Design a protein around this ligand. Structure first.
Ligand SMILES: CCCCCCCCCCCC
Ligand SMILES: [Cl-]
Length: 162
């Protein structure tokens, strides 16, 4: 089924700081496909609004350059589910976080997958944390994932992990 899991007691102020998209998966190969694929987003930093929203700073090569983006994940009465806003009010879900090393999150539509779902495994260091990746895969046995990208240290310290 669909993001059957979340974080109990998400101290959104403690996910503040810099993050490395260490790995990312999706329900549809086209999502993570090519380099320009829509949801091949590289998370730079999570900025929690004092009100309690979530400002995400991400990079995404659009026209031909590693472009830097910035979207705002607003708060809901569920502590660990945030909305973004487009023509299609997708939402962000934070599966799990130990606050210092890893943060597993997912972002979901509203209109079913197969159609839309993408989860990432964020680490704070540009290392390869096998155990974060184990918690990733564990958390995503449950899910309709069809593609799974994984990056290397060298790659992490580049823009759009080139
Ligand atoms: C703009 C396309 C959706 C990108 C949203 C990713 C935001 C990262 C969320 C991190 C949650 C802790
Ligand atoms: Cl509400």
């Amino acid at each position: 089924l669909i993001v059957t899991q979340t974080m109990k007691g998400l101290d959104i102020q403690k996910v503040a700081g810099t993050w490395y998209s260490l790995a990312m998966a999706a329900s549809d190969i086209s999502l993570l496909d090519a380099q320009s694929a829509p949801l091949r987003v590289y998370v730079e930093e999570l900025k929690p609004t004092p009100e309690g929203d979530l400002e995400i700073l991400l990079q995404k090569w659009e026209n031909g350059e590693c472009a830097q983006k910035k979207i705002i994940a607003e708060k809901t009465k569920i502590p660990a589910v945030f909305k973004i806003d487009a023509l299609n009010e997708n939402k962000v879900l934070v599966l799990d976080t130990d606050y210092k090393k890893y943060l597993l999150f997912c972002m979901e539509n509203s209109a079913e997958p197969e159609q839309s779902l993408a989860c990432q495994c964020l680490v704070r260091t540009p290392e390869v944390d096998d155990e974060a990746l184990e918690k990733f895969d564990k958390a995503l046995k449950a899910l309709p994932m069809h593609i799974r990208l994984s990056f290397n240290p060298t790659q992490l310290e580049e823009q759009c992990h080139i």
